[PDB]
Amino acid sequence: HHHHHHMVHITLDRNTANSWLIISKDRRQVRMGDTHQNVSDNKERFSNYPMVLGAQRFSSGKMYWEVDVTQKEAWDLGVCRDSVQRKGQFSLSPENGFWTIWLWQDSYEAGTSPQTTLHIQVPPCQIGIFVDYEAGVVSFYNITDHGSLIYTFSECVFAGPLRPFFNVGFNYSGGNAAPLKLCPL
Ligand SMILES: c1cc(NC[C@H]2CCCO2)ccn1
Numbered sequence: 667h668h669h670h671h672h673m674v675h676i677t678l679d680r681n682t683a684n685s686w687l688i689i690s691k692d693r694r695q696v697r698m699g700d701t702h703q704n705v706s707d708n709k710e711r712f713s714n715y716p717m718v719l720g721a722q723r724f725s726s727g728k729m730y731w732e733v734d735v736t737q738k739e740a741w742d743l744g745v746c747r748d749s750v751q752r753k754g755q756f757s758l759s760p761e762n763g764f765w766t767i768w769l770w771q772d773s774y775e776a777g778t779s780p781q782t783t784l785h786i787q788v789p790p791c792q793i794g795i796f797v798d799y800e801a802g803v804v805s806f807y808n809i810t811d812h813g814s815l816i817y818t819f820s821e822c823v824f825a826g827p828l829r830p831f832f833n834v835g836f837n838y839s840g841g842n843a844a845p846l847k848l849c850p851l
Pocket of ligand 1: 715716836
């Protein structure tokens with residue numbers, strides 16, 4: 667792809683994080699802690715899942731960023747509306763304000779409703795995410811496989827400002843402790 671020149675510097679918003687997440691000093695990495703991280707509760711925190719938002723809000727233009735997922739067994743990545751539900755149970759779908767892909771149990775899927783199987787020959791270690799606000803497009807790229815296309819959501823109805831979206835996943839297995847990292851430009 668040729669989206670690299672739309673690169674944006676994303677940082678994580680601590681205030682939105684589930685209370686078990688640990689965000690690095692530079693706000694560029696996030697991982698699952700083994701306990702509550704001793705923060706107060708607030709209406710912005712995702713309560714039920716190990717999720718966090720980027721601080722940046724997008725309402726126009728073209729934006730691109732990359733995320734490192736090396737050695738993880740489970741994660742969700744993409745964008746979401748600023749006004750998505752934070753508390754309780756919900757599914758990741760465009761109807762609920764999410765445009766996402768994930769890894770779960772050795773398969774990759776797009777967060778449509780119902781979910782769509784992805785066809786990935788080279789398991790990615792870094793994911794590229796492209797948003798074209800005006801066109802209503804969210805695309806995902808396999809950086810490990812020379813930028814090959816993973817998935818495109820088109821005809822998106824964003825219906826609000828967008829924020830970068832992250833889920834580090836649970837670590838019931840002991841094999842999913844590794845962080846998500848925002849990769850340098
Ligand atoms: C199972 C459930 C846990 N709940 C506390 C936090 C983590 C994400 C959702 O809320 C923590 C660890 N194992």
